[PDB]
Amino acid sequence: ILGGREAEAHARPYMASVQLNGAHLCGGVLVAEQWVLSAAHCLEDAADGKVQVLLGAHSLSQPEPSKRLYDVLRAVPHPDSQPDTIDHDLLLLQLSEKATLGPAVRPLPWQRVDRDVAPGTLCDVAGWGIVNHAGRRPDSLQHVLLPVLDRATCNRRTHHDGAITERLMCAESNRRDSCKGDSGGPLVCGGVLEGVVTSGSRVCGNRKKPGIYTRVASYAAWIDSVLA
Numbered sequence: 001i002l003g004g005r006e007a008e009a010h011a012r013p014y015m016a017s018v019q020l021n022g023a024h025l026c027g028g029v030l031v032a033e034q035w036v037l038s039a040a041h042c043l044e045d046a047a048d049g050k051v052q053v054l055l056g057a058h059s060l061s062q063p064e065p066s067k068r069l070y071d072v073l074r075a076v077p078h079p080d081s082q083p084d085t086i087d088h089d090l091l092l093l094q095l096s097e098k099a100t101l102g103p104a105v106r107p108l109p110w111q112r113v114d115r116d117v118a119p120g121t122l123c124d125v126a127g128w129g130i131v132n133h134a135g136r137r138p139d140s141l142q143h144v145l146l147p148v149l150d151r152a153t154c155n156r157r158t159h160h161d162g163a164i165t166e167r168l169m170c171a172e173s174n175r176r177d178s179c180k181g182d183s184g185g186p187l188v189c190g191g192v193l194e195g196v197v198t199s200g201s202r203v204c205g206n207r208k209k210p211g212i213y214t215r216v217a218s219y220a221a222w223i224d225s226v227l228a
């Protein structure tokens with residue numbers, strides 16, 4: 001997260017750290033008892049590395065009563081995802097057992113109504129991604145509030161030049177933004193999961209290259225199918 005602040009420990013009990021070989025790789029969001037939603041590009045190149053999900057965490061390094069590392073029974077990228085496209089960038093991780101719930105571990109309700117958020121809606125994005133241009137990695141969860149940017153602005157030739165489909169949404173990226181290590185994480189608007197961070201457009205903090213987020217509601221039937 002660029003331009004953000006340290007999040008209140010455990011105040012987003014849905015937040016997950018997707019880990020590769022014991023290091024944070026991507027964000028994710030607990031959406032069901034046994035399933036975490038993240039981005040397909042996160043595992044594009046993971047090959048047979050050890051993929052785990054850390055729930056209940058604020059600090060990546062320090063012990064906390066609610067922090068538990070889960071193994072992954074199955075990783076389900078969206079079948080239409082591809083390296084080098086921006087579209088369909090969702091991944092569902094089935095934990096090896098149901099998560100133990102509590103005040104610091106809870107699934108986030110997610111948007112099934114397929115309609116756009118109002119322009120400027122202030123949505124919350126959190127993550128353990130880099131926090132400056134040098135690439136510093138924070139130990140603890142960071143977050144920023146970002147206003148939703150209407151799709152027409154986002155599709156201007158000066159911006160993303162027509163690449164924002166109805167299944168994607170944007171948020172402003174003026175210095176405050178999601179960044180590397182934040183993909184897969186949640187864009188939460190009005191207390192409900194609306195979007196998943198994507199890296200499809202990799203630059204961070206350039207206002208003319210808004211954040212892109214995958215609209216969960218657009219993929220409701222796919223999420224439901226895989227969950228069940």
Ligand SMILES: CC(C)[C@H](Nc1nc(Nc2cccc(CN)c2)c2ccccc2n1)C(=O)O
Pocket residue numbers: 025026041042173177178179180181182183184197198199200201202203204205210211212
């Ligand atoms: C592992 C994922 C596929 C993803 N990769 C990734 N993402 C970058 N950027 C990025 C990530 C999330 C969000 C956005 C834009 N708002 C921009 C980035 C930038 C510079 C060089 C390599 C970069 N690798 C990530 O780390 O989330």
